[PDB]
Design an enzyme around this catalytic site. Structure first.
Site, PDB file in Angstrom:
ATOM      1  N   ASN A  36      -8.043  10.558  -0.359  1.00 55.60           N
ATOM      2  CA  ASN A  36      -8.536  10.001  -1.467  1.00 55.60           C
ATOM      3  C   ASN A  36      -8.246   8.532  -1.397  1.00 55.60           C
ATOM      4  O   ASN A  36      -6.999   8.059  -1.124  1.00 55.60           O
ATOM      5  CB  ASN A  36      -8.011  10.647  -2.714  1.00 55.60           C
ATOM      6  CG  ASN A  36      -8.661  11.895  -3.309  1.00 55.60           C
ATOM      7  OD1 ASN A  36      -9.715  12.042  -3.062  1.00 55.60           O
ATOM      8  ND2 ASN A  36      -7.802  12.890  -3.750  1.00 55.60           N
ATOM      9  N   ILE A  94      -4.214  -2.282  -3.218  1.00 57.12           N
ATOM     10  CA  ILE A  94      -4.606  -3.447  -3.914  1.00 57.12           C
ATOM     11  C   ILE A  94      -5.621  -4.489  -3.144  1.00 57.12           C
ATOM     12  O   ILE A  94      -5.144  -5.200  -2.143  1.00 57.12           O
ATOM     13  CB  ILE A  94      -3.483  -4.500  -4.311  1.00 57.12           C
ATOM     14  CG1 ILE A  94      -2.665  -3.836  -5.469  1.00 57.12           C
ATOM     15  CG2 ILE A  94      -4.093  -5.812  -5.405  1.00 57.12           C
ATOM     16  CD1 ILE A  94      -1.198  -4.311  -5.821  1.00 57.12           C
ATOM     17  N   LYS A 120      -1.877  -5.680   5.288  1.00 53.93           N
ATOM     18  CA  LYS A 120      -0.981  -6.080   4.494  1.00 53.93           C
ATOM     19  C   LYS A 120       0.543  -5.680   5.328  1.00 53.93           C
ATOM     20  O   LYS A 120       0.515  -4.994   6.165  1.00 53.93           O
ATOM     21  CB  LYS A 120      -0.786  -4.673   3.629  1.00 53.93           C
ATOM     22  CG  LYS A 120      -1.953  -4.490   2.679  1.00 53.93           C
ATOM     23  CD  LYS A 120      -1.756  -5.360   1.257  1.00 53.93           C
ATOM     24  CE  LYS A 120      -2.920  -5.129   0.376  1.00 53.93           C
ATOM     25  NZ  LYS A 120      -2.889  -6.413  -0.673  1.00 53.93           N
ATOM     26  N   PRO A 162       0.759  -1.083  -0.065  1.00 53.54           N
ATOM     27  CA  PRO A 162      -0.091  -0.169  -0.201  1.00 53.54           C
ATOM     28  C   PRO A 162       0.937   1.342  -0.109  1.00 53.54           C
ATOM     29  O   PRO A 162       1.916   1.189   0.177  1.00 53.54           O
ATOM     30  CB  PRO A 162      -0.802  -0.080   1.316  1.00 53.54           C
ATOM     31  CG  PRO A 162      -1.035  -1.505   1.566  1.00 53.54           C
ATOM     32  CD  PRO A 162       0.178  -2.287   1.128  1.00 53.54           C
TER      33      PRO A 162
HETATM   34  O1  LIG Z   1     -10.222  14.383  -2.683  1.00 58.96           O
HETATM   35  C1  LIG Z   1     -11.354  14.765  -2.606  1.00 58.96           C
HETATM   36  C2  LIG Z   1     -12.489  14.327  -3.357  1.00 58.96           C
HETATM   37  C3  LIG Z   1     -13.705  14.904  -3.192  1.00 58.96           C
HETATM   38  C4  LIG Z   1     -14.296  16.002  -2.346  1.00 58.96           C
HETATM   39  N1  LIG Z   1     -15.415  16.543  -2.317  1.00 58.96           N
HETATM   40  C5  LIG Z   1     -15.782  17.292  -1.246  1.00 58.96           C
HETATM   41  C6  LIG Z   1     -17.158  17.481  -1.502  1.00 58.96           C
HETATM   42  C7  LIG Z   1     -18.248  18.359  -0.795  1.00 58.96           C
HETATM   43  C8  LIG Z   1     -17.891  18.741   0.575  1.00 58.96           C
HETATM   44  C9  LIG Z   1     -18.936  19.698   1.078  1.00 58.96           C
HETATM   45  C10 LIG Z   1     -20.402  19.795   0.350  1.00 58.96           C
HETATM   46  C11 LIG Z   1     -21.229  20.630   0.877  1.00 58.96           C
HETATM   47  C12 LIG Z   1     -22.327  21.111   0.121  1.00 58.96           C
HETATM   48  C13 LIG Z   1     -22.241  20.533  -1.133  1.00 58.96           C
HETATM   49  C14 LIG Z   1     -21.387  19.780  -1.710  1.00 58.96           C
HETATM   50  C15 LIG Z   1     -20.199  19.247  -0.998  1.00 58.96           C
HETATM   51  N2  LIG Z   1     -19.209  18.679  -1.734  1.00 58.96           N
HETATM   52  N3  LIG Z   1     -17.426  17.099  -2.695  1.00 58.96           N
HETATM   53  N4  LIG Z   1     -16.254  16.438  -3.291  1.00 58.96           N
HETATM   54  C16 LIG Z   1     -13.090  16.585  -1.632  1.00 58.96           C
HETATM   55  C17 LIG Z   1     -11.700  16.038  -1.803  1.00 58.96           C
END
Ligand SMILES: Oc1ccc(-n2cc(-c3ccc4ccccc4n3)nn2)cc1
Lengths: 114, 114, 114
Positions: free
Chosen positions: A97, A64, A32, A1
């Site tokens: 992520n 993985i 792992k 990982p």
């Molecule tokens: O690595 C990432 C991947 C996705 C996100 N992500 C956060 C949010 C999020 C957070 C807060 C929110 C609040 C209201 C509407 C949409 C909103 N969406 N959407 N995608 C943040 C870091």
């Protein structure tokens, strides 16, 4: 990982022992063996979270398998925890992520894991 | 959402408020609130685009939803625009990877979004 | 295509021509013209592999197609060779993630590949 941290926390505030801790804790949580775990800490970074430059962390965990809903929930508790304890970053300023890698898409030792 | 810019352009050439403007601009475009957008700029990088080390950039935008054909097209105009204007980087020397994340695969605040 | 390598090997251990060499080898391997290849090397990094701070590297390769079982095995062999021959990194301390990007999810030149 593979766990990567990118943080606006300066290098000095990163403790000695931090990579070893990430390594042993992630081994325990993923199952792992430590031998296959890689950690990458990136301090002194030029980042913001929600418009503000208070301490924060952008991270990723590639594995993985051993990725999914409950596991990812658990991993995030463990990681936010260490980032709070050791780098004094607040959990609501951390984004992680998660990648469930196929063995065919991971290269190691002149080949792939497939 | 999570936005990262890696670039060979040096630190001094990154204007003050660039992070703010990215935060504010990614907010408008995505419909996500400014407070949850996190941005990250990595300048002074050893990189080449097309064999050349004229100014260039490799970006990534991770986001739960708001990732699609037309949206990505819109974002790339927006982000190239900004990279050209503020960092003097030619758009044809910019790659942006868009990742539509499942909520279970994004950790935040001791848990995940799912 | 886009090749990124992060390594705890120093900036000075990276020989001149390395970026150009990666660009060319990846052009051959990917079957893409070098005009479209981007490479990015990140030395001096704080990292560990199997909880050891011996030389190691974490890479990724992003491409619109050209990613699969037999090809990735071939990339790994090529890329681990360059990382051994040029940066003195043991091939069993290199991880490479391969990502098959959809045209629509890659931005370039004020638009997307869609
Ligand atoms: O690595 C990432 C991947 C996705 C996100 N992500 C956060 C949010 C999020 C957070 C807060 C929110 C609040 C209201 C509407 C949409 C909103 N969406 N959407 N995608 C943040 C870091």
């Amino acid at each position: 990982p593979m766990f990567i941290v990118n943080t606006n926390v300066p290098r000095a505030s990163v403790p000695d022992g931090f990579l070893s801790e990430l390594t042993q804790q992630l081994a325990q949580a993923t199952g792992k063996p430590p031998q296959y775990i890689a950690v990458h800490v990136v301090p002194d970074q030029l980042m913001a979270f929600g418009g503000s430059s208070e301490p924060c962390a952008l991270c990723s965990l590639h594995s993985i398998g051993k990725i999914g809903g409950a596991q990812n929930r658990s991993y995030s508790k463990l990681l936010c925890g260490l980032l709070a304890e050791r780098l004094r970053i607040s959990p609501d300023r951390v984004y992680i992520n998660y990648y469930d890698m196929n063995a065919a898409n991971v290269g190691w030792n002149n080949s792939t894991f497939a």
